[PDB]
Design an enzyme around this catalytic site. Structure first.
Site, short mmCIF file in Angstrom:
data_model
loop_
_atom_site.label_atom_id
_atom_site.label_comp_id
_atom_site.label_asym_id
_atom_site.label_seq_id
_atom_site.Cartn_x
_atom_site.Cartn_y
_atom_site.Cartn_z
N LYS A 107 -4.12 -10.53 -0.55
CA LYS A 107 -4.65 -10.39 -1.98
C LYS A 107 -5.66 -11.58 -2.43
CE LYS A 107 -3.64 -10.31 -6.89
NZ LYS A 107 -2.26 -10.78 -8.04
N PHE A 113 -11.38 -9.55 -10.26
CA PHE A 113 -11.33 -10.83 -9.95
C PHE A 113 -10.74 -11.25 -8.39
CE2 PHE A 113 -10.78 -11.02 -14.40
CZ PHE A 113 -12.10 -11.83 -14.77
N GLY A 114 -10.57 -9.90 -7.96
CA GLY A 114 -10.09 -9.95 -6.41
C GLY A 114 -9.67 -8.57 -5.98
N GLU A 115 -9.19 -8.46 -4.94
CA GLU A 115 -8.78 -7.21 -4.22
C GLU A 115 -7.32 -7.54 -3.41
OE1 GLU A 115 -12.16 -8.10 -2.90
OE2 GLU A 115 -12.68 -7.70 -4.75
N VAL A 116 -6.81 -6.26 -3.22
CA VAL A 116 -5.48 -6.23 -2.23
C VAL A 116 -6.02 -5.27 -1.12
CG1 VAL A 116 -3.22 -5.95 -1.98
CG2 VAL A 116 -4.19 -6.55 -4.19
N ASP A 135 5.61 -8.26 -8.17
CA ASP A 135 4.78 -8.42 -9.36
C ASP A 135 5.25 -9.76 -10.04
OD1 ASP A 135 2.68 -8.52 -11.29
OD2 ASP A 135 3.60 -6.63 -12.39
N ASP A 195 8.58 -7.09 -16.45
CA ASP A 195 7.88 -5.87 -16.03
C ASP A 195 8.48 -5.14 -14.87
OD1 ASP A 195 5.60 -4.21 -16.86
OD2 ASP A 195 4.37 -5.28 -15.38
N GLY A 210 -5.81 -2.14 -3.25
CA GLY A 210 -5.70 -2.44 -4.76
C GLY A 210 -6.81 -3.16 -4.97
N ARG A 226 6.22 1.12 -10.73
CA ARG A 226 5.00 0.82 -10.48
C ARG A 226 4.93 -0.54 -9.72
NH1 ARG A 226 5.10 0.82 -15.60
NH2 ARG A 226 4.85 -1.17 -16.73
N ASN A 227 5.96 -1.43 -10.17
CA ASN A 227 6.12 -2.79 -9.64
C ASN A 227 7.19 -3.05 -8.53
OD1 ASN A 227 3.98 -3.81 -10.95
ND2 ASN A 227 5.38 -4.02 -12.67
C1 LIG Z 1 -1.18 7.14 2.75
C2 LIG Z 1 -1.46 5.86 2.75
N1 LIG Z 1 -2.52 5.55 3.41
C3 LIG Z 1 -3.02 4.40 3.63
N2 LIG Z 1 -4.11 3.96 4.05
N3 LIG Z 1 -2.22 3.23 3.20
C4 LIG Z 1 -1.25 3.61 2.29
N4 LIG Z 1 -0.45 2.25 1.81
C5 LIG Z 1 -1.15 1.94 0.57
O1 LIG Z 1 -2.22 2.63 0.18
C6 LIG Z 1 -0.52 1.02 -0.05
C7 LIG Z 1 -0.64 1.13 -1.23
C8 LIG Z 1 -0.09 0.22 -2.22
C9 LIG Z 1 0.76 -0.85 -1.76
C10 LIG Z 1 0.82 -1.07 -0.05
N5 LIG Z 1 1.52 -1.92 0.17
C11 LIG Z 1 1.48 -3.21 -0.14
N6 LIG Z 1 2.26 -4.06 0.34
C12 LIG Z 1 2.21 -5.37 -0.16
C13 LIG Z 1 1.25 -5.58 -1.41
C14 LIG Z 1 1.22 -6.59 -2.16
O2 LIG Z 1 0.49 -6.39 -2.94
N7 LIG Z 1 1.79 -7.80 -1.86
C15 LIG Z 1 1.33 -8.86 -2.65
C16 LIG Z 1 2.32 -8.89 -3.58
C17 LIG Z 1 3.38 -8.12 -3.89
C18 LIG Z 1 1.92 -9.98 -4.53
C19 LIG Z 1 0.77 -11.05 -4.34
C20 LIG Z 1 0.15 -10.66 -3.24
C21 LIG Z 1 0.28 -9.76 -2.34
CL1 LIG Z 1 -0.62 -9.61 -0.91
S1 LIG Z 1 0.67 -4.04 -1.27
C22 LIG Z 1 0.22 0.04 0.38
N8 LIG Z 1 -0.56 4.85 2.23
#
Ligand SMILES: Cc1nc(N)nc(NC(=O)c2cccc(Nc3ncc(C(=O)Nc4c(C)cccc4Cl)s3)c2)n1
Length: 284
Positions: A38, A21-24, A149, A131, A17, A135-136
């Protein structure tokens, strides 16, 4: 407060992600455990810092199976980071669109029960999401769906689906669109849209209708039609989430109760609501 994690315990492995202003990242946290990470890039404003660490502060107040769990934060070093559990299957909307038709009706309804349990917890904790949308929602390798989110102004400001009041129109209750009344009852409206998203494997609500056309249809009394292969009880429930009068909507406790009873008597889900075909195929 929250757990302060030393940067040497965190290894970022892959971007999942990104923003200005940053990445996940997907990463590991020190046996190491997978985490999501994040970041907040240097030069962040005071408001950005309050919003960023504010999401972690909100998440650290919650402890529920269906709410994303906070591992900790890096605030004493730069860049700042929020570390959560890693949800292996990503966002629910993309997940369903990429797994079209692959689940049983009982699995789909179990997803909705989990989301509803998370939302019931949030509402009882006096947290209004504003929201709620597939998607969230994040999905792990046990198919558990968790609400994500969190924050105040940052939630709707950061969502591209939220358009200028900056709101994601086709997920938002009429009173929130009309006069900015966001409550747990407008979250219930959104949950009804999430039910429709899940049962359609992530179809776009109202399809190609414009935002103005969506608001016009809702105000004229139109509602989303039944998904294909949708249990009658499930369509009935999402319809009652979409009552114009806020006070007539079910509360999340009602929603969780109904979903729990349907899952416990799974034959109840075999009775399907009629589907309106848009295309007739005739064969002699
Ligand atoms: C098929 C495949 N391949 C690969 N490499 N990786 C994936 N999984 C992903 O791409 C993927 C996509 C979106 C979200 C996620 N998993 C997440 N878990 C927690 C997330 C997250 O944003 N946590 C978070 C939240 C919710 C709020 C504040 C800070 C943080 Cl660090 S994102 C994985 N799927």
């Amino acid at each position: 407060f929250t757990t302060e994690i030393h940067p040497s315990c965190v290894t970022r492995q892959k971007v999942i992600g990104a923003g200005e202003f940053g990445e996940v990242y997907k990463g590991m946290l020190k046996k190491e455990v997978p985490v999501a990470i994040k970041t907040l890039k240097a030069g962040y404003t005071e408001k950005q810092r309050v919003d960023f660490l504010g999401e972690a502060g909100i998440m650290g107040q919650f402890s529920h199976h269906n709410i994303i769990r906070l591992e900790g934060v890096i605030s004493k070093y730069k860049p700042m980071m929020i570390i959560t559990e890693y949800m292996e299957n990503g966002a629910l909307d993309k997940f369903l669109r990429e797994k079209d038709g692959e689940f049983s009706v009982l699995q789909l309804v179990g997803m909705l029960r989990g989301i509803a349990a998370g939302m019931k917890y949030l509402a009882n904790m006096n947290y209004v999401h504003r929201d709620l949308a597939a998607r969230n929602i994040l999905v792990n390798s046990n198919l558990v769906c968790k609400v994500s989110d969190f924050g105040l102004s940052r939630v709707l400001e950061d969502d591209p689906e939220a358009t200028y009041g900056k709101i994601p129109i086709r997920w938002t209750a009429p009173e929130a669109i009309s006069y900015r009344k966001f409550t747990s009852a407008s979250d219930v409206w959104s949950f009804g849209i999430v039910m429709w998203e899940v049962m359609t494997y992530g179809e776009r609500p109202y399809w190609e209708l414009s935002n103005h056309e969506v608001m016009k249809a809702i105000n004229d009394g139109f509602r989303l039609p039944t998904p294909m292969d949708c249990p009658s009880a499930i369509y009935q429930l999402m319809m009652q989430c979409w009552q114009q009068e806020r006070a007539r909507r079910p509360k999340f406790a009602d929603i969780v109760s109904i979903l729990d009873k349907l899952i416990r008597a799974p034959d109840s889900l075999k009775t399907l609501a009629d589907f309106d075909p848009r295309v007739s195929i005739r064969l002699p």
